[PDB]
Structures are given as structure tokens and as C-alpha cells.
């Protein structure tokens, strides 16, 4: 009687779809599709989706629907030895919400600054740029200098970020009041849209996750008809069969699909924890996976048609203009691609709003997962008033992101995106998968799926849950632990101490699970094997 149920069946579907879509399929997926094998990227993408995303998604959805709990205390009914996975998920999601909200802050500042008949980043002639100006081409009579930069580039690095004022990661300079007020407004929006629960989430997703689709569609309509759109699609579909021989393309496709579906994060548990008792979760997982894949595909088309248009109006070979990886692709390149076209105001506004809501829905999903997990873990003093402990986590995440709002926050947000996410979430996901697959009993899980839906899955899903997906996850994490990356951003390299701190942050979340099994022994005295046999099998419901 302490749980709840969604308003309808489409509400949970749209909420999980909004959780499955983010800026990933907007910018990271197409750049990967071009760099990592060209048009020949789709086949390994589909392979890794069938073998790495759908199994995890189906398993987590079914377990969350049956057990009706979060991701912290849900192991009391499954396998209580890995309860630290819950707290690891909480702190991981704290890191994620602290670094992600800065992107929405950038987007909403772009929105609030894009209300003018002449966009402030179209011409370099403002009171902040330097003598290194270089207007959009419009001609072939100019010689671009290495030190010369596009007007939108210097706008993004000198007005919305003030990044040149940062003399290195050792110092920070100062917080920007503009971005501070912007992220404060976005945090108030998140709270006032997440206060009640899934009853309000299912109503706000109707406009939160559906509005991006119409914006993407009108952008595709605008792009696919301009002179030069064909080169974009040709480059997006031109295969390169030699690339699939290297393991790099395969592991990058695996990482892309795993981050696009995002399982093992502890939010599918909370979402399915409100679904009906015997809803068609198999259909739900399949539909969500295909919708996420199709969204990534159509977003790749949308970005690459305008990239090809820009490459025909400017010099060709989008590979050169698509130099850097990150939000700079949208905030600099696509920014100019939109600004140089007629009706630039409305198009920039709708694009910025689409990015804003594609951030907000994912933030909603993550915070829902966190609050539901903690409420299921601590229902004694909490769970009576849900409006409390939500302001707590919102203020904590805001004061954590405060360190990113500084003038040199791009480096730290890219660091948090690169190291705090991948390894921690991958180890957590693989550990919970081998727990619910090797310790809880895959035969018990199949019998449970039978009891819920009405027919047990075939041997294919069985071997995918037992053999394919664990090997897949460990292969990803081992490939990531094979080549230590030395990344950079905006002509600035990352020092070695920055790499050590990134390793520490990316490991301060995996060291969270052993302290639970350590504290399990002090409070409960006795032999080790007794606690092992008590924590390998679940207790009474």
C-alpha cells in the first residue's frame, strides 16, 4: 500500500523513452558513426544493441516490475550482499547530475541570448572579441590563420564561458552570475516538475519528451532540401569495411550503444517499480530500444544533412569541420550552420529548447530513480512527506555543480563526463548483472518472468543474459582499462595530476560497495561463511 501506479500505460513508456534519449544520440552518436567506420557503423551498432542493450534493459525492467522496489533495498529480496551497489548508484547519479546540468545551463543561456533580430555570434564585432576575427566565408578571398577562429568559436570561448580567463586547471578565476542564475532557474524547474512523483512525471513527459521530436522533424525538413544535403547523407552512409577489423570500432560501438540505452544505472528499477503487476514489459523494453535506436538514426541524419550543407557552402569534407568531440560540435559548428540560414531566430530558439528538454527529461529520470531508491531504502523516518529530501538532493547537486559554473568549467565538466561515468557505471552494471544472473539464479528469474507475463523467454534470451551480456560488459571495461586516454580541449592539454584525480573520482564510486560488506561483519558477529550463505540467498518478502 506504500507504492503507487502510473496514470496510464503510455506514461511509463514515454518516461522510459525520455530516459533513453539524451544529448548522446544527438551529437556523440553521429560523430562516432562518421569517425568509427562511416556508414558501416550501423551493423556493429545493431549487433551490440541486440546483444548488449536489449538484454540488460529487459532484465532490469522485469526485475523492477516484479520486486516493486528501488535499487538500494531491492537486494534485500534478491541478494543482500551487494547492497552497496545502491549507494554507489546514488553517488554516481550525484556526479552525473552535477556535471550534466551545466550543459543545460549553457543551452538555456544560448536560448536567452538568442532573442535578437541579429544573433550576437553572427558577426565578431562585439565588445568581447579580439583582433583574431574571421567572418563566415561568403567568399574565397580570405586566408584563415591558425590563430584565427570563427566568430561563434570565440563567442563560445569568450562570452558564454570566458575560458581564456582560466590560466589552467590549477585555478578557477570566478563564478559567472549569468550561468549561476541560469542553472538556478533550471534547478527550480526540475524541482517543481519532480516534487510529487510519477503522477506528475507522466504528465510532464507528454510535452517534455514529445516536443523534441517535432523540432527534429522540422529541422530534418529544413536540412534535407538545401543545396548540399546529399553530401552529408553520402558521408553518413559511405562504408569503410577495413575499420571493423580493428577492435577499436567494435568497442566504441559497444560503448555508444551502452550509453545510449543506459542500463545498470538504477533508474529502470525505480520506473518499473511503479508499473502494473503484469504489464507487457517485454514489449515495453523492445519498443523503447527500437525507439532509441531510431531516434539516434534520425538525429544523425538531421545533424549530418546540415553539416553537409555547411560543408558545401564552406569548404567540403565535414571530417575537418567536425574536428572536436563534445558539446562544441553543437555549440560552435551547428550554431553557425543554423545562424547562417534564413529564419535563424526561430530555428535557433526551437533547437535550444529541444536541447533543454532533452536534458530536463534525463535529469527527471535520474532524480526519480535516486529519490525512489532512497525512499524504498529508508521508509521509516522518510517516505511520509515526499517533498522533503528532494530539495536536499537538489541543493546538494546545485552546490556541487557550482564548481563547474566557473570561467574554466569546460575542462572539469569534460573530465567528469569522461572518467566519472564510464568505468564506475560499467563496473556497477556488470556487478549487478552477474548478481541477478549468477547469484540470484537465472532459472528463478525465468520462472519469475513466466509468472509475470505468461510465457517464459526462449533459450536465446537465457544465453544472452548468462553468457552474451556479461562477456560484453567485461569486454567493454577491459578495453577501457587497456588504453589510458589523454584527452584535451580548446588547445589545452590535461596534466598528469588531472588524470590521477580523474582516476580517483572514477574509483571513489567502486570503492563504495566493499565498505558495505565490511560493515556487514562488525555489526553482525559470527563466522564469515554464515554471513555469506545468509547474503547469497534472499530473506522473506
Amino acid at each position, epitope marked *: 500500500g506504500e507504492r503507487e501506479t502510473w496514470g496510464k500505460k503510455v506514461d511509463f513508456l514515454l518516461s522510459v523513452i525520455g530516459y533513453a534519449v539524451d544529448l548522446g544520440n544527438v551529437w556523440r552518436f553521429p560523430y562516432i558513426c562518421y569517425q568509427n567506420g562511416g556508414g558501416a557503423f550501423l551493423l556493429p551498432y545493431t549487433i551490440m544493441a541486440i546483444f548488449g542493450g536489449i538484454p540488460l534493459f529487459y532484465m532490469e525492467l522485469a526485475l523492477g516490475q516484479y520486486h516493486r522496489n528501488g535499487c538500494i533495498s531491492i537486494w534485500r529480496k534478491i541478494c543482500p550482499i551487494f547492497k552497496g551497489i545502491g549507494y554507489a548508484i546514488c553517488i554516481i547519479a550525484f556526479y552525473i547530475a552535477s556535471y550534466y546540468n551545466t550543459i543545460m545551463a549553457w543551452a538555456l543561456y544560448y536560448l536567452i541570448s538568442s532573442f535578437t533580430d541579429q544573433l550576437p555570434w553572427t558577426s565578431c564585432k562585439n565588445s568581447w572579441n579580439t583582433g583574431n576575427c574571421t567572418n563566415y566565408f561568403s567568399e574565397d578571398n580570405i586566408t*584563415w590563420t591558425l590563430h*584565427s577562429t570563427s566568430p561563434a568559436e570565440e563567442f563560445y570561448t569568450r562570452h558564454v564561458l570566458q575560458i581564456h580567463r582560466s590560466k589552467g586547471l590549477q585555478d578557477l578565476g570566478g563564478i559567472s552570475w549569468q550561468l549561476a542564475l541560469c542553472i538556478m532557474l533550471i534547478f527550480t524547474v526540475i524541482y517543481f516538475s519532480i516534487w510529487k512523483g510519477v503522477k506528475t512525471s507522466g504528465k510532464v513527459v507528454w510535452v517534455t519528451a514529445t516536443f523534441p521530436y517535432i523540432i527534429l522533424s522540422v529541422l530534418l525538413v529544413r536540412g534535407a532540401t538545401l543545396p548540399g544535403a546529399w553530401r552529408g547523407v553520402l558521408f553518413y552512409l559511405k562504408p569503410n569495411w577495413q575499420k571493423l577489423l580493428e577492435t577499436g570500432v567494435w568497442i566504441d560501438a559497444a560503448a555508444q550503444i551502452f550509453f545510449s540505452l543506459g542500463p545498470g544505472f538504477g533508474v529502470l528499477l525505480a520506473f518499473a517499480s511503479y508499473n502494473k503487476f503484469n504489464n507487457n514489459c517485454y514489449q515495453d523494453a523492445l519498443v523503447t530500444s527500437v525507439v532509441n535506436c531510431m531516434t539516434s538514426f534520425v538525429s544523425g541524419f538531421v545533424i549530418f544533412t546540415v553539416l553537409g550543407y555547411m560543408a558545401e557552402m564552406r*569548404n567540403e569534407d565535414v571530417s*575537418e569541420v567536425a574536428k572536436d568531440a563534445g558539446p562544441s560540435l553543437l555549440f560552435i559548428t551547428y550554431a553557425e550552420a543554423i545562424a547562417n540560414m534564413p529564419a535563424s531566430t526561430f530555428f535557433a530558439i526551437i533547437f535550444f529548447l529541444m536541447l533543454i528538454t532533452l536534458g530536463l527529461d534525463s535529469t527527471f529520470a535520474g532524480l526519480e530513480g535516486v529519490i525512489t531508491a532512497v525512499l524504498d531504502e529508508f521508509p521509516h523516518v522518510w517516505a511520509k512527506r515526499r517533498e522533503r529530501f528532494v530539495l536536499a538532493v537538489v541543493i546538494t547537486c546545485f552546490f556541487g555543480s557550482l564548481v563547474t559554473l566557473t570561467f574554466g568549467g569546460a575542462y572539469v565538466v569534460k573530465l567528469l563526463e569522461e572518467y566519472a561515468t564510464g568505468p564506475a557505471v560499467l563496473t556497477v552494471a556488470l556487478i549487478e548483472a552477474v548478481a541477478v544472473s549468477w547469484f540470484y539464479g537465472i532459472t528463478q528469474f525465468c520462472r519469475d518472468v513466466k509468472e509475470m507475463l505468461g510465457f517464459s523467454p526462449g533459450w536465446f534470451w537465457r544465453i544472452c543474459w548468462v553468457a552474451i551480456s556479461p562477456l560484453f560488459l567485461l569486454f567493454i571495461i577491459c578495453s577501457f582499462l587497456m588504453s589510458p586516454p589523454q584527452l584535451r580541449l580548446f588547445q589545452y592539454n590535461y596534466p598528469y595530476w588531472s588524470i590521477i584525480l580523474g582516476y580517483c573520482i572514477g574509483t571513489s564510486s567502486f570503492i563504495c560497495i566493499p565498505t558495505y560488506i565490511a560493515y556487514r561483519l562488525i555489526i553482525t558477529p559470527g563466522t564469515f561463511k554464515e554471513r555469506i550463505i545468509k547474503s547469497i540467498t534472499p530473506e522473506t518478502p
Partner: antibody
Amino acid sequence: EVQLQQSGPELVKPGASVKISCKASGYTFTDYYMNWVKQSHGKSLEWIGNINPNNGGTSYNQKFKGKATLTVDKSSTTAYMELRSLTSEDSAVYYCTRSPVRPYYFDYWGQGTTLTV
Amino acid sequence: DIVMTQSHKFMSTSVGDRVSITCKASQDVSTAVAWYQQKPGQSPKLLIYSASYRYTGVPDRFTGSGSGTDFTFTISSVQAEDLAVYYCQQHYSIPRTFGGGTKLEI
């Protein structure tokens, strides 16, 4: 007014290594790229690689992965090219050209590296 | 990679008449084509970039036209010093590649 100096002729035993020089004078050396071209005995031109003075980057050709290692000496406005693992046919005339970022033409060239084997 | 073929090395047009030479491109390019000269023995020099924009410092004798796949390098009535070799360059893709070039006889 904008002259670029290089090395001269050198007949070297096959298997050894030669370090080519490229002087910059007339235009700001730290503002444009520094590429190299491979041309055989009265044959076509072929691009070799790319050099950036700010960070010493190198976007080498896939057909010259190890045939030439490229470094830059911004103090003397010079950029070397470590030519290791040389054979007889790789004894071709080269050039040091300036090039701005993405018009990709070669304004001023050198005097030709008459490398004999 | 990118291959820019054209006529042979011997086939050319003598002095006084119009001399038009093309250079076949593998893929399609918008305007990223450039031509060069090189006297036998000396260093190659730039002529025209973007296939129509002559670099600052060349006489009006030089002309550039053609786009897409067919690129016309039209010259006419060369002087006693315009005789040289002419390769076709592009700016499409790494690695950039030149062409075969053509003589100028007589």
C-alpha cells in the same frame, strides 16, 4: 622578401637517416602550417604530412606512417623530418611549403631537397 | 584515396593558340581545386586556388573555370616565360594528392 632555406644535396648509403631543415623568414612562422611534398625524378607531386607550430601535431599520410617522423623547432622557426628506414626509391626531392588552415594551398616553397642514394 | 587523373605528359598545345586542359577528379568537389607551375629544375609555384580565384601576384593571363568534375585550366598565347608544367591539386580530403601534370610544347 619571404625566403625559405633548406638543406642541400647528400648522397647517403641505403639504410641510413637524414634530417631535413626548413628555415622560415618573411611571414610569421607560428601562423601557418608546414607540410612536405614527395616528388620522384621528374614525376608527380605527393603530399607527405602536416605540422602545427603551436603543439607540434602531425596528421601523417597513411602511406607514410613510419617512413618519416616529423618534429618542429619553433625557436629557430625550423621543422625537421626524421627520415628513418630509407630505401633507394625513397630518395626523392622534397619541399617545405607554407599553408594556411583550410584553403590548403602552398604559397611559398623551398629550393628542392636533392637527396641522392 | 583521392586520385586526380588528366591527359598524358606529352599531349599539349603550342604557343599562340588557346590551351585548355582538364583534370578528372575521383569524387565530386565544390570548388576545391588548385593549379601550380614548375620550371624544369626549379621549385613549384602557386597559380590559382578554388579553381577560379587567382592568388595575389599573378598576371591576368591566367584563367580558371570549371566546377564539379570538369575543371578547365584555360591559357592562350603563352609568352617566352609562361612555358611550364601544370598539375591539378585539390583540397578535398586527407591525404591530399596532386595530379600527373602536362608539358607545354612548343
